[PDB]
Amino acid sequence: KKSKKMQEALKKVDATKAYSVEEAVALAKDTNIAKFDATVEVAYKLNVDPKKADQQIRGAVVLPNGTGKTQTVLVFAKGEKAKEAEAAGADFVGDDDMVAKIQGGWFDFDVVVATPDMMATVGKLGRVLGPKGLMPNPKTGTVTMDVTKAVEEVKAGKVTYRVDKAGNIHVPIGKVSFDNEKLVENFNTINDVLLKAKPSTAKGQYIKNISVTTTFGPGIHVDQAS
Amino acid sequence: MRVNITLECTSCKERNYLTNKNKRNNPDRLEKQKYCPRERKVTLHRET
Amino acid sequence: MRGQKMNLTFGLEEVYEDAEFHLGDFDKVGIVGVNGAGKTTLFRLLLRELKLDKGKITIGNSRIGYLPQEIIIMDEKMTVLEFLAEGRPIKKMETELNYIYEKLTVVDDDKQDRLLKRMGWLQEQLEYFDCYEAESILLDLVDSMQIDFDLFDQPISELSGGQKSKISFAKVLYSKPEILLLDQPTNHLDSSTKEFVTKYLKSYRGSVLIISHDIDFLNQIIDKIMYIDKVTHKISIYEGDYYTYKKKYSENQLLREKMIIQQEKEVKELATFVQKAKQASQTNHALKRMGLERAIRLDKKKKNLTKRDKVYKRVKMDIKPNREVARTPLKVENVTFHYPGHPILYKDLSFQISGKERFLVVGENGVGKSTLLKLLMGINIPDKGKIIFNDKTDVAYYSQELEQLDEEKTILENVKSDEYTDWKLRATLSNFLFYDDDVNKKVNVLSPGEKARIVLCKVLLQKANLLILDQPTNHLDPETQSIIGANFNLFEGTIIVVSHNPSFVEQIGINRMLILPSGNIDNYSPELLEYYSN
RNA sequence: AUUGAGUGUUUGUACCACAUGUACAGGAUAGGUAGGAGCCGAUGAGACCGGAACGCUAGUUUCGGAGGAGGCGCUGGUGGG
Numbered sequence: 088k089k090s091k092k093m094q095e096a097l098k099k100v101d102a103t104k105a106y107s108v109e110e111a112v113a114l115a116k117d118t119n120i121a122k123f124d125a126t127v128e129v130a131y132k133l134n135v136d137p138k139k140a141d142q143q144i145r146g147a148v149v150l151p152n153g154t155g156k157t158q159t160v161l162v163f164a165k166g167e168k169a170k171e172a173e174a175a176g177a178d179f180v181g182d183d184d185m186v187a188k189i190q191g192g193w194f195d196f197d198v199v200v201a202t203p204d205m206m207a208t209v210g211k212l213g214r215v216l217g218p219k220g221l222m223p224n225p226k227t228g229t230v231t232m233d234v235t236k237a238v239e240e241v242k243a244g245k246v247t248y249r250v251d252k253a254g255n256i257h258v259p260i261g262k263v264s265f266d267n268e269k270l271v272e273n274f275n276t277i278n279d280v281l282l283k284a285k286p287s288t289a290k291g292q293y294i295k296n297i298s299v300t301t302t303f304g305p306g307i308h309v310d311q312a313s
Numbered sequence: 314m315r316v317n318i319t320l321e322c323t324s325c326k327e328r329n330y331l332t333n334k335n336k337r338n339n340p341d342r343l344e345k346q347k348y349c350p351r352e353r354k355v356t357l358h359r360e361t
Numbered sequence: 362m363r364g365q366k367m368n369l370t371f372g373l374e375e376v377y378e379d380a381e382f383h384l385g386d387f388d389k390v391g392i393v394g395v396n397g398a399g400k401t402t403l404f405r406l407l408l409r410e411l412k413l414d415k416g417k418i419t420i421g422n423s424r425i426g427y428l429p430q431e432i433i434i435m436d437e438k439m440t441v442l443e444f445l446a447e448g449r450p451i452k453k454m455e456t457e458l459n460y461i462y463e464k465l466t467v468v469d470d471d472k473q474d475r476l477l478k479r480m481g482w483l484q485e486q487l488e489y490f491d492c493y494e495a496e497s498i499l500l501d502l503v504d505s506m507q508i509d510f511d512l513f514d515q516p517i518s519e520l521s522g523g524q525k526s527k528i529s530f531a532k533v534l535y536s537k538p539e540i541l542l543l544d545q546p547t548n549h550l551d552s553s554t555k556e557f558v559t560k561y562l563k564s565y566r567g568s569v570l571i572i573s574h575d576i577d578f579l580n581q582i583i584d585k586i587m588y589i590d591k592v593t594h595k596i597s598i599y600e601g602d603y604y605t606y607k608k609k610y611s612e613n614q615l616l617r618e619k620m621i622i623q624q625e626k627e628v629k630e631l632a633t634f635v636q637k638a639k640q641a642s643q644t645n646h647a648l649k650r651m652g653l654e655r656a657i658r659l660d661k662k663k664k665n666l667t668k669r670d671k672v673y674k675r676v677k678m679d680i681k682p683n684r685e686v687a688r689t690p691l692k693v694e695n696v697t698f699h700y701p702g703h704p705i706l707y708k709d710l711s712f713q714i715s716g717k718e719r720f721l722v723v724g725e726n727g728v729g730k731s732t733l734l735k736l737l738m739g740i741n742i743p744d745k746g747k748i749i750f751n752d753k754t755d756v757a758y759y760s761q762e763l764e765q766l767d768e769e770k771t772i773l774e775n776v777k778s779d780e781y782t783d784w785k786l787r788a789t790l791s792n793f794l795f796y797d798d799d800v801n802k803k804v805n806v807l808s809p810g811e812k813a814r815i816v817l818c819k820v821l822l823q824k825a826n827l828l829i830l831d832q833p834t835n836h837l838d839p840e841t842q843s844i845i846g847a848n849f850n851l852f853e854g855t856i857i858v859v860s861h862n863p864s865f866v867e868q869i870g871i872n873r874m875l876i877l878p879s880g881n882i883d884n885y886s887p888e889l890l891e892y893y894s895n
Numbered sequence: 896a897u898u899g900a901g902u903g904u905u906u907g908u909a910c911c912a913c914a915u916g917u918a919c920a921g922g923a924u925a926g927g928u929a930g931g932a933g934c935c936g937a938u939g940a941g942a943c944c945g946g947a948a949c950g951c952u953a954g955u956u957u958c959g960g961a962g963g964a965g966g967c968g969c970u971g972g973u974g975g976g
C-alpha cells in the first residue's frame with residue numbers, strides 16, 4: 088500500500104495521537120523526505136456544509152512570513168492607476184484591451200485583480216479565469232481601490248482559501264525548509280483568520296479536525312485547543 | 314352563513330372595525346375605505 | 362415537513378380544517394385524494410405560494426424541486442431550450458451581475474460597499490450552481506428520456522402533451538433539487554416513458570412527494586401514503602402502499618360505521634321508552650317520573666352522538682346520442698398532413714369507421730395522435746385528401762390539453778348553451794359534483810381534474826353520436842376513471858379514442874385499433890401489446 | 896429501583912479496514928479540494944500468462960505464476976474540471 092519510505096515515515100507518526108502545533112510542525116520537518124523543497128499544508132475539516140448559502144466560506148490572508156514562492160500579479164487598471172500598479176511591483180499590468188492577449192496568452196500566472204470597476208471589462212474573460220480560479224473575487228481581496236496595497240501584499244505571500252463543497256479547507260502555510268518558529272507563526276495566522284471567518288449561523292463544534300501534512304508525507308492530526 | 318369579521322387597516326395593520334358579512338354572498342375578503350384612527354386618515358381596510 | 366392546525370377556506374368551501382401531518386425525511390410519500398381534495402394546495406403551502414388562514418406549515422431549508430400539474434409557458438414563443446434553461450438560476454444571476462458591473466462604473470465611492478457584497482454573493486452563488494451545466498443539460502435530455510435535439514430548438518407550445526411532460530420532468534431534474542414535489546409526473550407519458558420515471562424515482566435517494574392517480578405507478582415507489590380527505594378536510598398518513606392505505610382506510614370507516622350504529626340503537630331505545638311514558642295516563646306517576654329521567658339521558662345521548670361523515674358522491678354519467686349512427690360515420694381518404702417545416706406525419710392516410718364502433722388511435726408520444734383528431738374536427742386543414750362526415754353524424758371533441766374552457770368565466774357560464782335552460786344545467790353539474798354555488802366559481806381557480814369534468818359535461822350535453830376523445834381519463838381520480846370507462850362502454854355511438862391508460866381501453870372494449878406512425882387499421886386484440894413492443 | 900452474568904438473532908450509532916466513482920469531448924473509467932516536479936521499482940520494474948470481482952460492456956481493480964529492470968507524471972491537446 089505504501090513504499091518503504093512512506094512506511095518508515097509512518098513508523099514516526101502515531102495515528103491516534105493529536106499533536107501540539109509545536110510538535111506537529113517539527114515532526115513535519117522529518118516526514119518531508121520527498122526529494123525537493125516540499126510545501127507544508129494545513130487542512131481544517133470545518134463542520135459547515137457549504138450547500139447552505141450562508142455557510143459558504145471564502146477569502147484570503149496575507150501570511151506574515153509568506154509561502155516562500157513568488158506570485159505573478161496581473162492588474163487591470165484604468166488611467167494613471169496602472170502606473171501605480173507597476174510602481175507597486177506588479178509583474179505585468181494590462182490595459183482594458185489586453186484581455187485579448189490574456190486570451191490564449193500570458194498564462195502560467197498566479198492572480199488577477201481589478202481596480203475595482205475594471206470588472207465590467209474583466210467579466211468577458213471571467214469564463215476563462217472563472218473555472219481556473221483566477222477570477223477576481225472581492226471576498227478574496229483581489230478587487231479594491233487600493234491596488235497599491237493589493238500588489239505588494241501578494242508579493243508578500245498572500246494565500247487564498249476556500250471551503251470545498253465536501254466541507255474541507257486547504258491552505259499552503261510555507262515550505263518544509265522554513266524554521267519551525269516561522270512555520271508555527273504562519274499556522275497560527277491561518278487559525279485566527281478561519282475563526283474570524285466563522286459563519287454566524289454555525290452550530291456546534293466548529294473545527295472538527297485539523298491535520299498538518301507535507302506535499303508527500305502523511306497527515307498529522309493536531310489539537311485546535313493548543 | 315352570516316359571520317362576524319374584522320376589517321384590518323392595510324397600511325398600519327390595526328384591526329379597526331367590527332362588522333359582519335354573509336360568506337355565501339361575499340366569498341372574498343370584504344374591502345372598504347375606512348378612517349384609520351391611528352393614521353387619522355381614510356385607508357383601505359380588508360377583512361383579516 | 363410538518364403542518365399543525367392547518368386551516369384554509371377559499372370563500373365558503375373549505376380545504377383543511379385542523380389538519381395535521383408529519384413527514385419524516387427520506388420518505389417517498391404518495392399523496393392521494395379525489396379531484397379537488399387539495400393535493401395541489403398542499404404543495405402551494407410548502408412552496409409558500411399560499412398562506413394558511415390559521416395554523417403553521419413547517420418546511421425544511423433544503424431546496425425543493427417542484428413539478429407543476431400544469432405546464433407554465435410564460436410566452437408562446439419560448440423555445441424548449443429556453444424553458445429548460447430557466448430551471449437553473451444561472452441566467453437570472455448573470456443579468457443581475459451584468460447590471461452590478463454597470464453600477465460600479467457609474468458609482469465611484471457611494472454604493473461600492475453594497476455593490477461589492479452583491480457581486481461577491483452572485484459569483485459564489487454562480488459557482489455553487491456550476492456554470493458547466495450548459496453542456497450537462499444538452500446530454501441530460503439524451504440520457505433521461507431520449508428527447509431528440511430537434512425538439513431542443515422548437516417552441517415549447519408546439520410540443521405534444523406527452524413531449525411537454527418529458528420536458529417539464531427534465532427541467533425539475535435539471536435544477537438539481539433536494540426535495541422532489543411531483544404533481545402527476547406521468548400525466549401524459551406513454552408506457553415506455555413511464556418506465557424511466559419509475560426507475561429514477563425508485564433510485565432517488567432523497568425525499569420525493571408524488572401526487573398521482575396511477576395506483577400501479579405509486580405502488581412501485583411509495584413507502585408512505587398521505588390521503589387528503591375531501592369530506593373530513595383532514596390529512597392521514599399511512600405506512601405502506603396504496604392497497605395498504607385502502608385496507609386500513611376501509612377498515613377504519615367500517616369500525617366507525619359500527620360505532621354510529623350502536624349509538625343510534627341506544628338513542629332509539631331511550632326514545633322508545635320516553636314516548637311510552639309520554640303517552641301513558643297522567644295517573645301513572647312512577648312511569649311519568651321515569652319518563653322524565655330517561656328524557657334527561659336521551660338528551661345527553663343525542664348531544665354526544667357522532668355524526669357519520671357524508672360519503673363523497675361519485676360521478677353519474679348518462680351519455681346518449683340524439684340521432685343514430687350510420688354505417689359510415691367518418692370517411693378519411695388519402696389524407697396527408699405535415700406541420701410547416703416538419704416531416705410528414707402520415708401519407709395517404711385512408712380509413713373508414715363503421716358506426717357504434719370503438720376506434721382506438723394507438724401510438725407513442727409525439728407520433729401524430731392528437732394531430733389526427735384535430736384533423737377530423739377541422740382545426741387542421743389536410744394538406745392532401747378529404748375528410749367527409751355523413752350528415753347523420755354529430756361530433757363531440759375532448760381536447761387533450763383542456764383548451765375548450767374560458768378561464769375568465771365561471772363554470773355555469775362555460776356550460777351555457779342555447780339548447781339548455783338554467784335548472785337543466787345545474788342538475789347535470791351536480792351529477793358532476795358541482796353543487797350549488799360551486800358552479801359560480803371561476804374556471805381559473807379550479808384544479809385540472811375539476812376542469813376535466815366541465816369539459817366532459819360539455820361533451821355530454823352535446824348528445825353527439827360520434828365521440829372524438831383525446832386521453833379522457835387524464836387528470837381524473839381513479840374512481841372517476843372507472844365510471845368514465847363503464848359509461849362509455851354502454852354509449853350507443855361511435856367512439857374515436859386515444860388513451861395511454863391500459864385499464865380505460867379495456868373497459869371501453871375497443872374494436873379496431875389504428876397504429877401510428879405506421880398506418881395499420883387492425884382488429885383490436887392483445888396484439889396491441891405486440892405493436893407496443895415493436 | 897431492588898437487579899447480576901451470558902449466548903444468539905435483528906437493529907441505531909462511531910470509528911477502522913477495505914473496495915466504488917465510465918455524462919459528451921478527450922490518450923480513456925479525470926469523484927471533490929489543496930499541495931505537486933518529480934514519483935515508484937532486484938524491500939523484484941515494465942511487458943507476458945492464468946484465476947477472481949465489478950461492469951455503463953469500453954474496459955477498471957485485485958491475487959498468483961514465470962521473467963529480471965524498468966516505468967509513471969510534468970512538457971503535449973481535449974474539457975467546466
Ligand SMILES: Nc1ncnc2c1ncn2[C@@H]1O[C@H](COP(=O)(O)OP(=O)(O)OP(=O)(O)O)[C@@H](O)[C@H]1O
Pocket residue numbers: 519520521522523524525549551700701703724725726727728729730731732733761
Ligand atoms: N403546432 C405544431 N407546430 C409544429 N409542430 C407540431 C405542432 N403540433 C405538433 N407538432 C408536432 O407533431 C408531432 C406529433 O403531433 P401530436 O400533437 O399529435 O402528438 P401526440 O400524438 O398527441 O403525442 P402525445 O399526445 O402522446 O404527447 C410532435 O412532434 C409535435 O412536435
Ligand SMILES: Nc1ncnc2c1ncn2[C@@H]1O[C@H](COP(=O)(O)OP(=O)(O)OP(=O)(O)O)[C@@H](O)[C@H]1O
Pocket residue numbers: 371372376394395396397398399400401402403430802806807808809810811836
Ligand atoms: N382561489 C380559489 N378560489 C376558490 N376556490 C378555490 C381556489 N383555489 C382552490 N379552490 C379550490 O380548492 C380546491 C382544492 O384545491 P386543489 O386544486 O389543490 O385540488 P387537487 O386535489 O389538487 O385537484 P386534482 O387532484 O384534480 O388535480 C379546488 O376544488 C378548488 O376548486
Ligand SMILES: [Mg+2]
Pocket residue numbers: 400401402430544572808809
Ligand atoms: Mg392537483
Ligand SMILES: [Mg+2]
Pocket residue numbers: 521522523730731732761831
Ligand atoms: Mg396528444
Ligand SMILES: [Zn+2]
Pocket residue numbers: 322323324325326327349351352356
Ligand atoms: Zn391604519
